Amino acid sequence: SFFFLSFHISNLQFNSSLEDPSTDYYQELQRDISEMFLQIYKQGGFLGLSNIKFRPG
């Protein structure tokens, strides 16, 4: 099955870098959050997650 998930990271500022998928900071945050998800769901059932969308909150 597929599941959409939205959450807030309350201790990071949204900034112009996170508006631009090509920046080092955007790519680093997307990578690190993706890694985190693989750790949360460290089972054979979890295949992966999509590209991440960042929005100002």
Binding site: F2, F3, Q39
Partner: protein
């Protein structure tokens, strides 16, 4: 704050939206200690694709 939105894929089976959300919310304390991410406002839904 930074809002994060994504979709997850699980192999067909018994895993449901409650399973997914509970596992994520239970990880909040580890997200803070391990990733220094303070996670809130968790919203999970079934989607067709």
């Amino acid at each position: 704050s930074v809002v994060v939105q994504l979709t997850m894929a699980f192999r067909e089976g018994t895993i449901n939206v409650h399973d997914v959300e509970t596992q994520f919310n239970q990880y909040k304390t580890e997200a803070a200690s391990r990733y220094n991410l303070t996670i809130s406002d968790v919203s999970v839904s079934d989607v067709p694709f």
